[PDB]
Amino acid sequence: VDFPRSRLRFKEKLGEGQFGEVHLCEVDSPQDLVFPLNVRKGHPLLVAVKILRPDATKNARNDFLKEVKIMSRLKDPNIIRLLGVCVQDDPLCMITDYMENGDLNQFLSAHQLEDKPTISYPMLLHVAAQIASGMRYLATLNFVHRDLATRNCLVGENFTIKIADFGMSRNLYAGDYYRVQGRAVLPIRWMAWECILMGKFTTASDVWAFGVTLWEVLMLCRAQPFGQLTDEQVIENAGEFFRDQGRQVYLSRPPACPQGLYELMLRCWSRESEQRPPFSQLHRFLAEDALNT
Numbered sequence: 001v002d003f004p005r006s007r008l009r010f011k012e013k014l015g016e017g018q019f020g021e022v023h024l025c026e027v028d029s030p031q032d033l034v035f036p037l038n039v040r041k042g043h044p045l046l047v048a049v050k051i052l053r054p055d056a057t058k059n060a061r062n063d064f065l066k067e068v069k070i071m072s073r074l075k076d077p078n079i080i081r082l083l084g085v086c087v088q089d090d091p092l093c094m095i096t097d098y099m100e101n102g103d104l105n106q107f108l109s110a111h112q113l114e115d116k117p118t119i120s121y122p123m124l125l126h127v128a129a130q131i132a133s134g135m136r137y138l139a140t141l142n143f144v145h146r147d148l149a150t151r152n153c154l155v156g157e158n159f160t161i162k163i164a165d166f167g168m169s170r171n172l173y174a175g176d177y178y179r180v181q182g183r184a185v186l187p188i189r190w191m192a193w194e195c196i197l198m199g200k201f202t203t204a205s206d207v208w209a210f211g212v213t214l215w216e217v218l219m220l221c222r223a224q225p226f227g228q229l230t231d232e233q234v235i236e237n238a239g240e241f242f243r244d245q246g247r248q249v250y251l252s253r254p255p256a257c258p259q260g261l262y263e264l265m266l267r268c269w270s271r272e273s274e275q276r277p278p279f280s281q282l283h284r285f286l287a288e289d290a291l292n293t
């Protein structure tokens, strides 16, 4: 059953969509609803609401209803949660937790690595481990994300990370997608070679993108993957992975990244998809290192 729309109180616009908007809202008298809201009595309960325009087209309403159906399955501490929906009248609504530190690319971009806002090496590992645990969960569901990157991760309180999917809706990240007329829009610099050559997207290609997302984290989001290469060179490099003549190239080791952790990234970029580590091993490695450094 629907969330009570009358309890949602507009505060400000968080984002623009092609077909609607994302609003920051307060929930009036939320203890009543407790709908798995995270309620500290007498403290504002803030949620993000994705909202479809009242004049929304049939195509847009269909896509929203499918996004409700997909997101309704996802129940893990490191994945965006649907707290509720309002789908029986317009505008159609989907409600999620407000992640007050924004997307992870913006968050890390505002920090530098601590020198013996700053962030420590073990906390960077903890952020990456949370991402690997959320991806571990999605792999158990045979859910392929297809667009894992730090711009699609959200940051809450106490460095909590949740994986989400903004759906290529943002000017800020337009140069992270390769656009050709009549083709799917493609985040080529995070795509495994078989995705670029074949459209083959699998949990093994989500591991390759996790390798690139881990690179971004250890770069503190200071640089686009392959940022000195054109898009055409990035595509040509996918070709060199297939050709396997030893001319393919890889992201370089970030300044913050020890060689051991770099070798973990390199395994995620194995030419053979079956040589790439599973997310359960990636999580273990990063959490152990998070716990012990």
Ligand SMILES: CCS(=O)(=O)c1ccc(Cl)cc1CNC(=O)c1cc(OC(F)(F)F)cc(N2CCNCC2)c1
Binding pocket: 015, 022, 048, 049, 050, 067, 070, 071, 074, 079, 080, 082, 094, 095, 096, 138, 145, 154, 163, 164, 165, 166, 167
């Ligand atoms: C925070 C981003 S947002 O755009 O502000 C916003 C705000 C509130 C709400 Cl309720 C929803 C959203 C946006 N949709 C998502 O985040 C989301 C998360 C998903 O699950 C994850 F793949 F595992 F990531 C999957 C999807 N699918 C829609 C796109 N095709 C694939 C399935 C969307």
